[PDB]
Ligand binder design. Sequence first.
Ligand code: CLA
Ligand code: CLA
Ligand code: CLA
Ligand code: BCR
Ligand code: BCR
Ligand code: SF4
Ligand code: SF4
Lengths: 73, 86, 184, 218, 112, 119, 79
Amino acid sequence: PWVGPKKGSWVKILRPESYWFQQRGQVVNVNQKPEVKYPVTVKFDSVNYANVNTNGYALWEVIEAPAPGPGEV
Amino acid sequence: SHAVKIYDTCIGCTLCVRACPTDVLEMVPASINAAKQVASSPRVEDCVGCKRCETACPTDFLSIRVYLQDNEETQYSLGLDLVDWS
Amino acid sequence: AKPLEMFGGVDIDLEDTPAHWTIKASPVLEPCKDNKKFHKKLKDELYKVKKNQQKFAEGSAAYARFNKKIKMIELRETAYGDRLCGKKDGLPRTIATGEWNVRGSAMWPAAIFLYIAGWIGWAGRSYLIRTNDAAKEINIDVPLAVTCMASGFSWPVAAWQEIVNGEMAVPNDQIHNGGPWNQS
Amino acid sequence: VVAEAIPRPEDLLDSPKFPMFEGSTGGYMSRSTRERHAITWTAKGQAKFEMPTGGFAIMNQGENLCYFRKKEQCIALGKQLRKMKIENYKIYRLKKDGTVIFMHPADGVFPEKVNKGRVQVNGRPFTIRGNPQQSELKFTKYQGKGYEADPLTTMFVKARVMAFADVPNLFALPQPNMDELVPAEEVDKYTRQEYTTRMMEALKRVQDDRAAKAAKSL
Amino acid sequence: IFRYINTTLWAKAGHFNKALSKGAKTTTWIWNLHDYAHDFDIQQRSTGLIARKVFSSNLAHLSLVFFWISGMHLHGAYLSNYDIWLKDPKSITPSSHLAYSLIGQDILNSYT
Amino acid sequence: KYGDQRKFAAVLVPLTTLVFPAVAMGMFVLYSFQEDAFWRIVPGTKRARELDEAWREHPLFANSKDPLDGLINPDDYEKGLEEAWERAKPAGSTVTVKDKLKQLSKQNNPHWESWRAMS
Amino acid sequence: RVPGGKRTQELGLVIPMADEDGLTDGQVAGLFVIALVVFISAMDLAKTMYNGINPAKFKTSKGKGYISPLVKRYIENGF
Ligand code: CLA
Ligand code: CLA
Ligand code: CLA
Ligand SMILES: CC1=C(/C=C/C(C)=C/C=C/C(C)=C/C=C/C=C(C)/C=C/C=C(C)/C=C/C2=C(C)CCCC2(C)C)C(C)(C)CCC1
Ligand SMILES: CC1=C(/C=C/C(C)=C/C=C/C(C)=C\C=C\C=C(C)\C=C\C=C(C)\C=C\C2=C(C)CCCC2(C)C)C(C)(C)CCC1
Ligand code: SF4
Ligand code: SF4
């Protein structure tokens, strides 16, 4: 039984200290081990100050938002 | 001495350990990430405070955070060479 | 009781009529064509430029260019005659009361600039919306760029139609609000 | 792991373990400092390297030994050696008395390599934003050090933050009766377990009085 | 030999440095591109390219200095009062530099 | 005469702008080498420890530093928490409230206020 | 006096000086006595502020403390 958002599905970030808070990014993969605290891996078009466009988030920090659309983060 | 804390968001990069110039950080086994390892700071008394570990950390916000404490400086945290405090 | 001396020099209208709401009724100002300071300043300009002109040869090109400058100065003197200038400086003033019907009013330049500035901003926003990529910002898609630049003329209508139809703004819950201020 | 017998640098003049190095003014300042750090390693060929204190050096085909004032210089030289595929280098801190403390490969395994028996020191079990607010821990153990709070304290203050926003349902603390309480401390009735029963009954009386008073014009 | 002198890299800004190959993700990329422009040492390819770049850039700058000298010479021949200065240098200030009569800039030219 | 106050100045000005400042600077550099020097801002002074212990000896301020101070009946709070966790305990989970709180209180920060070891 | 500034010279502004003394030496000494009193009291206050409150006084100091009857009312009137 798959857990978390599907691969390639857009999710809105709910981590307040994240550089992409309330932004959206494609789900690269979700780790299926229940022991992993932050299994969801999300990649973004906008890099942060460390020039990193991907990060691993918790299961409770992604809400499966729709596609961004024209001129929308 | 400063205060170097490691948070759960660590993904076992080992980059923070490699970037530390005074061997403050080390890798310990854990079970909260796919790498089965998290960083630790057992020797922050040798932490000068260069924050290279924070530069090297790739998590969204640093899984390793160095808190500067200037009213706390020791001879090791200041990198004293000409002068000994022991 | 002589408001000039009561208030240390400044004078007050003392009359409550709508006909004095125009800038032209102000006692500080005066039409430039009948102001002594205006005459003296532009006469001094003419005198200085003419004195510079005599220093050169009669048949030189510099003499002709100074004649052209003198004609420009006299044209400026006659053109600013209807413009309002203060009764003590002689320098013509710019009207910023929204009069729309006085010499030197700021309404016409404001309207022109606001139109063209909205045009520039709308063209840039349209190009950014239609090129949702960083590669298109360093290597400009020139045909699309000039298409948006030409299309920007209808900004005062298209922008409002986007404002009311929910296509300009975005809810705060879709963009990064800012740094966290709490959690514990 | 067995610590070596690194002698004090002022007593090991002219040792065969010293690499051929040019020698500069950047070395440790004697006559003012007594704490020295020593790094030893075994090389395979006399490959030239750079001393952390200015000037270049040539290793020995066998054992090597260098003395430095700071651990940072020893670690810099250790990284430089490790770039040359030279492992098995150990860094010691020499106390003024001559005590040898084994520092860098503390458990014999380099810190970037996971080794069993290690425990996450200074670990915090939440995201960095999960730290409690500094304002909440005023005049407690963590007065200006909210990042040092144990996770139980963080959860407790988080629950307090959650609670102290539903203002209408809060319980105002009763005003103490200073004039008629407050006898000499020797004047007490003991019965500690009865004192909590007295707390229960007194607070029940206070709440009943408050409800009765509120149900007059509300 | 010269068949490799191609314009294909003109559009590809930042080609010379391998740290700029990731693309202009941020505005720092622009400043880095301008900063590494003449840093031939850190740019891509072997040491021979460093020598070629250094020598050819020296020649290009020398051409630039020659162009500046040529501009000064043409200003002196066609935009100057060097004739009357030759005839009477103690009464004529040197001037090979005019200003157009725009926005009243005519006030900058003075009697020489 | 309008002067005759300079008799006071010729003593006071040299005194308060030379003798007092020099004595103050010497006394300050002497005070800098006391074990009590700047005991309110400099960590690890003896007087700071004595003041903290004196505060802790007061009956009102005994359990003042505890962030969890306030629970009138901590046994009731713990019992209610245990009851609420029992109804929400996931399947055959083996964690109790008591040891969970005990291990959530015990963290590992050896280098926190280690300056309380010299004075 | 050698004046500076345009206005002093062009208006003739002058600075009169009393030919008398102002205050006699006795008055200055009378002021200095109270200044010394302020000085002693200020040194004492600086000492007290430097040392701060001593909570452990109830173990050694005599008496039993005192809360004024208005201070109790202010305690129980609220905050
Ligand atoms: C002729 C000389 C001159 C020059 C060189 C400038 C230069 C400038 N003006 Mg400007 N201005 C001038 C005359 C001039 N002004 C006159 C005569 C007026 C009338 C009083 C104004 C009124 C004016 C305003 C009201 C604003 C400027 C702004 C600006 C700056 C941004 C340029 C721009 O539009 O970017 C291109 C435009 C964009 C990238 C975004 C679009 C923004 C513009 C203002 C369109 C807004 C239209 C909107 C629907 C109506 C707004 C109503 C109200 C908020 C004013 C720029 C430095 C802006 C500024 O400084 O912002 C910090 C600004 O907001 N100007
Ligand atoms: C023969 C002279 C010469 C040569 C060949 C070089 C060559 C070099 N220098 Mg160098 N330098 C020189 C003189 C020279 N320099 C002088 C005189 C100074 C003292 C100021 C410096 C200070 C200097 C520093 C601090 C650095 C270099 C660096 C470099 C290297 C890369 C330069 C680069 O990419 O910049 C690209 C070119 C520019 C960014 C030019 C921008 C324009 C300048 C900065 C502003 C000039 C303003 C202008 C004069 C006024 C404008 C007019 C106004 C009215 C508008 C390159 C090897 C850099 C390096 O990494 O070396 C390896 C480096 O960090 N140089
Ligand atoms: C704000 C307080 C203050 C200040 C800044 C001054 C300033 C001055 N007084 Mg003075 N004075 C004051 C109060 C003050 N007076 C009072 C209240 C008296 C009456 C006792 C006098 C009696 C007095 C005499 C008799 C003479 C001066 C003189 C002087 C001058 C030389 C400084 C000196 O040696 O004074 C010495 C003055 C004293 C020792 C009296 C006590 C000084 C005050 C009360 C202490 C205030 C300190 C203040 C709280 C700052 C403390 C912190 C500091 C370390 C930064 C100088 C302009 C001399 C001079 O040349 O005048 C023309 C002089 O002959 N004063
Ligand atoms: C001609 C004319 C006109 C027109 C005009 C116009 C149209 C103009 C435009 C103009 C423009 C269009 C301009 C623009 C400008 C821009 C600018 C000028 C920019 C600037 C920038 C800056 C300033 C920067 C800033 C910053 C940042 C980046 C961020 C951070 C902060 C800071 C601030 C640093 C009119 C008719 C009216 C009148 C007559 C004359
Ligand atoms: C009349 C007059 C006056 C007054 C004025 C006023 C009072 C004004 C106001 C104004 C205002 C009160 C405004 C407001 C606004 C708000 C808002 C909210 C806005 C917004 C905007 C926007 C949103 C824009 C957008 C855009 C466009 C449209 C184009 C470009 C691009 C963009 C996107 C930017 C004066 C006194 C001066 C003088 C006389 C005349
Ligand atoms: S660099 Fe950051 S994420 Fe990587 S191991 Fe170190 S602390 Fe963890
Ligand atoms: S701040 Fe520097 S010395 Fe301290 S742990 Fe980080 S990298 Fe190591």
